[PDB]
Amino acid sequence: TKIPRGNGPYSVGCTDLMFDHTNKGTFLRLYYPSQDNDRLDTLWIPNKEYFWGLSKFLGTHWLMGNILRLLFGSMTTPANWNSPLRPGEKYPLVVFSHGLGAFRTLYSAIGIDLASHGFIVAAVEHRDRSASATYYFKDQSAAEIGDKSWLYLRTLKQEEETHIRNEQVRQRAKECSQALSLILDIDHGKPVKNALDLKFDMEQLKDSIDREKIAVIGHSFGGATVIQTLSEDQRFRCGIALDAWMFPLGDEVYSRIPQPLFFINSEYFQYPANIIKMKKCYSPDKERKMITIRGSVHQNFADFTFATGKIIGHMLKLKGDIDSNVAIDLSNKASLAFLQKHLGLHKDFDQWDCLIEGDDENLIPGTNINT
Structure with a gap:
């Protein structure tokens, strides 16, 4: 309801796709240009179990899950649920990787x-136990019945963090690559039975993808995921890391990323041990850009920044000093200029090329840490 509408001229649809039905299958939420703009009715958090998972992630218990559920269980996001895909054009494709606990x-x-x-x-919804919750089906009959097997976030000990975070980032990159293969195979006529029964016919995605214009974007854990996925999969032609959390990555990735990479940071999250890993990606033979959104916190990139009032938002660290709409417009506009530049798009996003340089009252070129 306070999650902002898209600023572009296309109307937006949304559906869910799970294939195959198993814990090793792909699970993703699709946002797409819709033919028609009938009602902004997509349910934001569609199952009670995500609220239960958010509560466990936050360190609270059962009452917290029910409170979040009471507060946000019927909150919508502004997209036409299961609206037909807009025909007549091949669209560039972004694979998006969520943060830890998202x-x-x-x-x-x-x-x-x-x-x-x-x-x-x-x-994508990751099945590495970094999501607060996710689900899959133990067999085709459980999928037919909607009999969901839930997987909740794994809490780690200290001695575990180094090994398991790196195993999770590798699974995450496999899941981004698998999600891309799923969409590309559908684009080229692979018959798929969605494990979820929804009005959106996935045959509409046949011959709807511009297969040369693929990018990967992600927040926090998903920013590390961007870098791992780029190093393994040359089908992704550039990456945008939103407040990348670099800890999970092994030292071998930094030399292994030919594609252009864009770091969009919050002012109040970053720290030298994290920033130094970002600088390790920099090379004169490669395109790396970094901007910092002035007055932003980590959560400015995720939807909970629009879920509460200005005052509660500041106390819970969901909002920064900057207005949440101003911050997301800067991140999205700079993203669009970067995607136009490195995917070769024939649009007008280059009007925001200056935001890539950090040339704005609300942007810092590079980082406040050491730029």
């Missing part, structure tokens, strides 16, 4: 804005 529906302000500018967005 899941596929929590970056709709970004997904919806990109889609309103003519992108298809596949927001």
Whole structure:
């Protein structure tokens, strides 16, 4: 309801796709240009179990899950649920990777804005136990019945963090690559039975993808995921890391990323041990850009920044000093200029090329840490 509408001229639809039905299958939320703009009715957090998972992630208990559920269980996001895909054009494609404790529906302000500018967005739900919650089906009959097996976030010990975070980032990159293969195979006529029964016929995606114009975007854990996925999969032609959390990455990735990479940071999250890993990606033979959104916190990139009032938002660290709409517009506009530049798009996003340089009252070129 306070999650902003896309600023672009396309109307936006949304659906969910799970294939195959198993814990090793792909689960994603699709944002796309819709033919028609009938009602902004997409349910933001569609199952009680995500609220239960958010509560466990936050360190609270059962009452917190029910409180979040009471507060946000009927909150919508501004996209036409299961609206037909707009025909007649091949769309560039973004694969989006969520942060630790998030899941596929929590970056709709970004997904919806990109889609309103003519992108298809596949927001993946990771099954590495980094999502607060996710689900899959133990067999085709459980899928037919809607009999969901839930998987909740894994809490780690200290001695575990180094090994398990790196295993999770590797699974995450496999899941981004698999999600892309799923969309590309559908684009080229692979018959798929969605494990979820929804009005959106996935045959509409046949011959709807501009297969040369693929990018990967992600927040926090998903920013590390951008870098791992780029190093393994040359089908992704550039990456945008939103407040990348660099800890999970092994030292081998930094030399292994030919594609252009854009770091969009919050002012109040970053720290030298994290920033120094970002600088390790820099090379004179490669395009790396970094900007910092002045007055932003980590949560400015995710949908909970639009979920509360200005005052509660500041106390819970969901909002920064900057206005949440001003911050997301800067991140989305700079993203669009970067995607036009490195995917070769024939649109007008280059009007924001200056935001890539950090040339704005609310942007810092590079970083406040050491730029």
